[PDB]
Ligand binder design. Structure first.
Ligand code: GTP
Ligand code: MG
Lengths: 165, 41
């Protein structure tokens, strides 16, 4: 089986870090992504093609070019960035309004849980207003890219969504 | 940066293509456009 995943979120959220932790099993250095990275991750007999798309504000208008055929969205949030959590919500809701993503499922990663004052998954749920989403299957998972904690639990959820049609 | 509708159409078709060369082209196109915009500052 296959699943096309679009992974977006504000710049510095940790997307590229997550992509290569999944693909290569390690934390590698990154630079802010101008454009995208794409890798296929084989997991539970599913080939997940994951599109890691840059989140600097200057290139957010490009996110729309990646919506077509997307089956799962991974929206990555810096759990320690209280100053920009609402900005993340604004981008998330703006993207969810799009018809091309009507049938996409949503996995939110509350990332950087290793940081001393990181907001937990429940707080991020509240701040993003996820409970208000309609006609959408969604899940939130706390993650730490370094240890890898939460990453495969996220893929497990996506996998179960695909399996149940 | 991306106001030119025609360049946007080129970018959109490359990003939605199944051909690996098109995807490489798109990725470079985005960097060029950003870099050119960085110029002209
Ligand atoms: N403390 C901590 N830092 C992280 C974690 N994940 C990523 N980072 C750091 O956050 C910074 C941004 O990470 P990136 O992976 O480049 O972020 P991105 O989301 O790809 O950013 P854009 O390419 O601009 O969209 C880097 O310095 C990473 O080292 C994490 O789980 N914990
Ligand atoms: Mg990146």
């Amino acid at each position: 089986g296959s699943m096309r995943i679009l992974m977006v979120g504000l710049d510095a959220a940790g997307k590229t870090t997550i992509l290569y932790k999944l693909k290569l099993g390690e934390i590698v250095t990154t630079i802010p992504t101008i454009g995208f990275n794409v890798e296929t991750v084989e997991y539970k007999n599913i080939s997940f093609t994951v599109w890691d798309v840059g989140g600097l504000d200057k290139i957010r208008p490009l996110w729309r070019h990646y919506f077509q055929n997307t089956q799962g969205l991974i929206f990555v949030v810096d759990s320690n960035d209280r100053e920009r959590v609402n900005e993340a919500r604004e981008e998330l809701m703006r993207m969810l309004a799009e018809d091309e993503l009507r049938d996409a499922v949503l996995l939110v990663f509350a990332n950087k849980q290793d940081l001393p004052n990181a907001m937990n998954a429940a707080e991020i749920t509240d701040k993003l207003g996820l409970h208000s989403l309609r006609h959408r299957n969604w899940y939130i998972q706390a993650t730490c890219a370094t240890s890898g904690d939460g990453l495969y639990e996220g893929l497990d959820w996506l996998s179960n969504q695909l399996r149940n049609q | 940066i991306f106001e030119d509708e025609e360049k946007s159409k080129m970018l959109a078709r490359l990003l939605k293509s199944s051909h690996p060369e098109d995807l490489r082209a798109a990725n470079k196109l985005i960097k060029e456009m950003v870099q050119e915009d960085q110029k002209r500052m």
